Design an enzyme around this catalytic site. Structure first.
Site, short mmCIF file in Angstrom:
data_model
loop_
_atom_site.label_atom_id
_atom_site.label_comp_id
_atom_site.label_asym_id
_atom_site.label_seq_id
_atom_site.Cartn_x
_atom_site.Cartn_y
_atom_site.Cartn_z
N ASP A 119 0.58 -28.43 -39.54
CA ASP A 119 -0.11 -29.29 -38.59
C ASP A 119 -0.25 -28.63 -37.22
O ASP A 119 0.72 -28.10 -36.68
CB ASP A 119 0.64 -30.62 -38.44
N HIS A 121 -1.43 -30.08 -34.29
CA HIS A 121 -1.55 -31.00 -33.17
C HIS A 121 -0.64 -30.58 -32.02
O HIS A 121 0.55 -30.90 -32.02
CB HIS A 121 -1.23 -32.43 -33.62
N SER A 172 1.62 -32.23 -45.26
CA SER A 172 2.33 -31.10 -44.65
C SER A 172 3.50 -31.53 -43.78
O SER A 172 3.90 -30.80 -42.87
CB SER A 172 1.37 -30.22 -43.84
C1 B12 Z 1 -7.34 -34.42 -31.00
C2 B12 Z 1 -6.96 -34.60 -32.47
C3 B12 Z 1 -6.81 -33.47 -33.25
C4 B12 Z 1 -6.65 -32.12 -32.61
C5 B12 Z 1 -5.14 -31.93 -32.20
C6 B12 Z 1 -5.04 -31.45 -30.74
C7 B12 Z 1 -5.11 -29.91 -30.66
N1 B12 Z 1 -4.06 -29.21 -30.38
O1 B12 Z 1 -6.25 -29.37 -30.89
C8 B12 Z 1 -7.12 -31.16 -33.72
C9 B12 Z 1 -8.51 -30.55 -33.33
C10 B12 Z 1 -6.14 -30.01 -34.09
C11 B12 Z 1 -7.43 -32.10 -34.87
C12 B12 Z 1 -7.68 -31.65 -36.14
C13 B12 Z 1 -7.32 -32.30 -37.30
N2 B12 Z 1 -6.79 -33.52 -37.40
CO1 B12 Z 1 -6.71 -34.65 -35.86
N3 B12 Z 1 -6.99 -35.96 -34.52
C14 B12 Z 1 -7.03 -35.83 -33.23
C15 B12 Z 1 -7.28 -37.27 -32.66
C16 B12 Z 1 -8.86 -37.07 -32.64
C17 B12 Z 1 -6.88 -37.76 -31.30
C18 B12 Z 1 -5.50 -38.48 -31.26
C19 B12 Z 1 -4.63 -37.64 -30.31
O2 B12 Z 1 -4.86 -36.45 -30.16
N4 B12 Z 1 -3.67 -38.30 -29.70
C20 B12 Z 1 -2.84 -37.50 -28.78
C21 B12 Z 1 -1.72 -36.83 -29.59
C22 B12 Z 1 -1.92 -35.31 -29.67
O3 B12 Z 1 -0.47 -37.09 -28.89
P1 B12 Z 1 0.47 -38.31 -29.37
O4 B12 Z 1 0.64 -38.28 -30.83
O5 B12 Z 1 -0.05 -39.56 -28.67
O6 B12 Z 1 1.91 -37.98 -28.64
C23 B12 Z 1 2.80 -39.04 -28.46
C24 B12 Z 1 3.58 -39.57 -29.65
O7 B12 Z 1 2.97 -39.38 -30.90
C25 B12 Z 1 4.96 -38.86 -29.52
N5 B12 Z 1 5.06 -37.48 -30.01
C26 B12 Z 1 4.11 -36.70 -30.53
N6 B12 Z 1 4.55 -35.51 -30.87
C27 B12 Z 1 5.91 -35.49 -30.55
C28 B12 Z 1 6.91 -34.51 -30.68
C29 B12 Z 1 8.20 -34.86 -30.25
C30 B12 Z 1 9.35 -33.89 -30.33
C31 B12 Z 1 8.53 -36.16 -29.68
C32 B12 Z 1 9.91 -36.45 -29.25
C33 B12 Z 1 7.50 -37.12 -29.57
C34 B12 Z 1 6.24 -36.73 -30.02
O8 B12 Z 1 5.14 -38.77 -28.15
C35 B12 Z 1 3.89 -38.50 -27.48
C36 B12 Z 1 3.87 -39.14 -26.10
O9 B12 Z 1 2.56 -39.78 -25.92
C37 B12 Z 1 -6.98 -38.24 -33.81
C38 B12 Z 1 -7.92 -39.48 -33.89
C39 B12 Z 1 -7.17 -40.82 -33.81
N7 B12 Z 1 -7.34 -41.61 -34.86
O10 B12 Z 1 -6.47 -41.13 -32.84
C40 B12 Z 1 -7.13 -37.34 -35.01
C41 B12 Z 1 -6.08 -37.42 -36.16
C42 B12 Z 1 -4.65 -37.49 -35.56
N8 B12 Z 1 -6.32 -36.14 -36.88
C43 B12 Z 1 -6.09 -36.27 -38.16
C44 B12 Z 1 -6.47 -35.24 -39.11
C45 B12 Z 1 -6.75 -35.82 -40.54
C46 B12 Z 1 -6.81 -33.95 -38.73
C47 B12 Z 1 -7.12 -32.75 -39.65
C48 B12 Z 1 -6.02 -32.40 -40.66
C49 B12 Z 1 -8.54 -32.92 -40.31
C50 B12 Z 1 -8.85 -31.77 -41.31
N9 B12 Z 1 -9.37 -30.66 -40.83
O11 B12 Z 1 -8.57 -31.98 -42.52
C51 B12 Z 1 -7.40 -31.59 -38.63
C52 B12 Z 1 -6.28 -30.48 -38.65
C53 B12 Z 1 -6.76 -29.16 -39.27
C54 B12 Z 1 -7.69 -28.38 -38.41
N10 B12 Z 1 -7.75 -27.04 -38.44
O12 B12 Z 1 -8.46 -28.98 -37.62
C55 B12 Z 1 -5.83 -37.71 -38.54
C56 B12 Z 1 -4.35 -37.99 -39.04
C57 B12 Z 1 -4.34 -38.96 -40.26
C58 B12 Z 1 -4.20 -38.32 -41.65
N11 B12 Z 1 -5.14 -38.44 -42.60
O13 B12 Z 1 -3.18 -37.68 -41.89
C59 B12 Z 1 -6.34 -38.50 -37.30
C60 B12 Z 1 -5.58 -39.83 -37.03
C61 B12 Z 1 -7.87 -38.71 -37.48
C62 B12 Z 1 -8.18 -39.85 -38.44
N12 B12 Z 1 -8.58 -41.00 -37.89
O14 B12 Z 1 -8.11 -39.84 -39.67
N13 B12 Z 1 -7.02 -33.36 -34.61
#
Ligand code: B12
Length: 601
Positions: A119, A121, A172
């Site tokens: 992953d 992200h 994964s």
């Molecule tokens: C931007 C994003 C990405 C980005 C990730 C950012 C980056 N580095 O580029 C990228 C472009 C990689 C992307 C791609 C994919 N992604 Co994407 N993505 C998103 C998206 C559009 C936005 C949500 C988001 O980014 N939130 C912000 C995240 C990054 O932060 P956060 O989780 O809020 O963080 C908080 C908490 O989770 C927690 N936390 C998180 N991590 C950690 C770690 C620790 C240690 C701790 C303590 C806490 C913690 O604390 C944080 C405080 O806010 C969502 C859409 C949605 N439905 O929301 C889909 C989503 C998450 N993606 C998903 C998927 C499917 C993919 C892909 C695998 C698609 C594919 N190609 O097959 C690809 C990955 C492979 C690839 N090569 O692209 C799915 C996950 C569901 C599933 N089926 O498993 C979503 C939900 C889309 C969907 N609606 O189906 N993605």
């Protein structure tokens, strides 16, 4: 107005309001008050950590949102960047006086954040690593592509008090259980934190928590990290919290094992006998594509992609969500709670996007393909243009999965498979299948440049903008295929407003999605279309596409095609799929882990 206050109050106001206009001058005015702070360590420990604690408390209470927290972190980073020479001078003075540099740490504890070999992200881990800085926590951020052995080694040599894994997808996550097992068999008691805001506690308490004899806490957001990580450092609650309520894993195991009897499955032969049958003799005949092979896009116009961007996923990065019915873009801008911050992030993103699409710092790239396709049961075969499908041999094969969980008799929904949307070989009707891949190049450089500057806000914004551009490129390329490159939907007059609603004809099921969770299809796609050599989109050893802002998938032109979820499958379908793919059952059992309907343990 606020400038008239004392230097401590000015520091607190700058930290809380996220203003870098006078941070350096106020810091200088504060340090020149030597009597008020005999040690240069005292200035940070006083007014600086006070404002950051206020910011963290407000974030935990929900009064302050994520972008303001990031801006406050930027202000503190600027102040500390100004102050580092004096911290180093003080440390050298301490070394001169007491002989050695002491183990004094202004942060409450050291935390190692890592993203598994999988992953990609990265935004959430960075947000956590900077909010913990707002929570006054030292964070060692290992980024993406961090090996498990590297995770453990970094935890050991740096003497990390907490290891934090990252997870945002269902597939994964078996690397997280792998590193948990490695840590358990290394016999270390360091507390562990798990995943992000997609991970349910089911996967934690089934394959992670009854797998490690040390605290394994699951946190939903870094706003509550103030309580959660302190409770792992507060010795009054460290020895009790990790097992007082984490006992609920017992409910998660027993109750779900009891519920396993509720799950029922059909035999694979019976499921095939109830597949998505359709009369191809009355269905419209497939439309032949304009070409067979691959057409490469080398310098795609970034200016055009801006019209196709959907922003609700982008606002989900900033955690800005409104109340119903005023929820989501563009209704998010009018909500009183999040309207101003949403406006701020939207305008900042648009400004940087306009700067980048005018300076040509980014470059879109992609390729699309079309081949004749004929389906043998639960499989898709691809041939050459001049070959006769019934007499020749396929050049590439894509293997589909069929739904196997028993459905209630009230519903007559067929047990779907991907092969049901392509005409069978024996029918005499010739069908075609397409595939595509897109990417945005340069995000991994601009993000690093912004991070080295110290502007994590701009780094997160540019990462989100690259993701938005990649998805907009995928949507636009699909729009061109349906109307120009394949022309099976040329009569459509829809626009982006309906493209965001998936009202177009045909589907583009990406490999790894619930439609076909086997990620190994990307290998066949890359081999067939020569994608790596042509466009430059690499495939990771975990089949992740590099750069992270990339999208790929197949093209199905059938009118009745629709998205579906495979659900759960039995070992019968597992062995059948393995024998079709001519691979060992162990590989299938690990690639289709999330969708397995039985427990091997
Ligand atoms: C931007 C994003 C990405 C980005 C990730 C950012 C980056 N580095 O580029 C990228 C472009 C990689 C992307 C791609 C994919 N992604 Co994407 N993505 C998103 C998206 C559009 C936005 C949500 C988001 O980014 N939130 C912000 C995240 C990054 O932060 P956060 O989780 O809020 O963080 C908080 C908490 O989770 C927690 N936390 C998180 N991590 C950690 C770690 C620790 C240690 C701790 C303590 C806490 C913690 O604390 C944080 C405080 O806010 C969502 C859409 C949605 N439905 O929301 C889909 C989503 C998450 N993606 C998903 C998927 C499917 C993919 C892909 C695998 C698609 C594919 N190609 O097959 C690809 C990955 C492979 C690839 N090569 O692209 C799915 C996950 C569901 C599933 N089926 O498993 C979503 C939900 C889309 C969907 N609606 O189906 N993605």
């Amino acid at each position: 107005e606020w400038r008239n206050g004392p230097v401590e109050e000015r520091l607190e106001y700058a930290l809380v309001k996220g203003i870098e206009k006078h941070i350096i001058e106020d810091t200088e005015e504060a340090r020149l008050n030597q009597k008020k702070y005999p040690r240069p360590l005292n200035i940070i420990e006083g007014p600086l950590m006070n404002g950051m604690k206020i910011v963290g408390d407000l974030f935990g209470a929900g009064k302050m949102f994520l972008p303001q927290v990031i801006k406050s972190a930027r202000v503190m980073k600027k102040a500390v960047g100004h102050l580092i020479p004096f911290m180093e001078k003080e440390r050298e003075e301490t070394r001169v006086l007491n002989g050695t540099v002491e183990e004094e740490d202004p942060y409450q504890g050291t935390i190692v954040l890592a993203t598994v070999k999988g992953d990609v992200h990265d935004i959430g881990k960075n947000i956590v690593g900077v909010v913990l800085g707002c929570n006054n926590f030292r964070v060692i951020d290992l980024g993406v592509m961090t090996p498990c052995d590297k995770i453990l080694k970094a935890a050991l040599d740096h003497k990390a008090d907490i290891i934090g894994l990252s997870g945002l997808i269902t597939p994964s996550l078996d690397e997280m259980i792998f590193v948990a097992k490695e840590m358990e068999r290394l016999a270390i008691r360091i507390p562990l934190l798990i995943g992000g805001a997609t991970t349910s506690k089911t996967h934690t308490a089934v394959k992670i928590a009854p797998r490690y004899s040390a605290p394994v806490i699951h946190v939903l957001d870094a706003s509550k990290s103030v309580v959660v990580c302190s409770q792992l450092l507060d010795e009054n609650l460290k020895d009790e919290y990790f097992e007082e309520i984490m006992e609920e894993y017992e409910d998660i195991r027993q109750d779900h094992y009891e519920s396993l009897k509720e799950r029922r499955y059909l035999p694979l032969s019976q499921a095939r006998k109830s597949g998505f049958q359709m009369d191809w003799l009355s269905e419209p005949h497939p439309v032949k594509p304009t070409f067979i092979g691959t057409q490469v896009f080398e310098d795609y116009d970034l200016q055009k992609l801006v019209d196709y961007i959907d922003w609700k996923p982008f606002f989900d990065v900033w955690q800005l969500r409104g109340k119903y019915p005023n929820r989501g873009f563009p209704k998010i801008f009018n909500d009183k709670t999040v309207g101003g911050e949403a406006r701020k992030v939207y305008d900042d993103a648009h400004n940087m996007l306009n700067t980048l699409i005018s300076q040509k710092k980014l470059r879109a790239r992609g390729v699309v393909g079309f081949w004749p396709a004929q389906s043998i049961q639960d499989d898709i075969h691809l041939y050459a243009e001049a070959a006769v499908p019934q007499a020749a041999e396929p050049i590439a094969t894509f293997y589909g999965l069929r739904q196997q969980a028993e459905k209630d008799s009230a519903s007559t929904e067929p047990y779907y498979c991907l092969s049901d949307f392509i005409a069978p070989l024996h029918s005499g009707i010739r069908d075609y299948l397409g595939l595509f891949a897109v990417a945005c190049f340069g995000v991994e450089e601009l993000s690093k440049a912004y991070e080295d500057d110290g502007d994590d806000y701009s780094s997160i914004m540019v990462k989100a903008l690259g993701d938005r551009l990649a998805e907009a490129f995928a949507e636009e390329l699909h729009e061109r295929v349906r109307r120009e490159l394949w022309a099976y939907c040329g009569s459509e007059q829809l626009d982006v407003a309906d493209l965001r609603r998936l009202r177009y004809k045909g589907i583009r099921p990406a490999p790894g999605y619930p439609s076909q969770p086997d990620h190994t299809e990307k290998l066949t796609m890359w081999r067939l279309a020569d994608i790596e050599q042509s466009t430059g989109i690499r495939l990771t050893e975990s089949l992740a596409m590099a750069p992270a802002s990339a999208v790929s998938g197949l093209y199905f032109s059938n009118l009745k095609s629709k998205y579906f979820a495979v659900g759960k499958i039995s070992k019968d379908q597992v062995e059948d799929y393995a024998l079709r793919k001519n691979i060992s059952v162990a590989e299938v059992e690990k690639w289709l882990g999330p969708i397995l309907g039985y427990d091997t343990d």
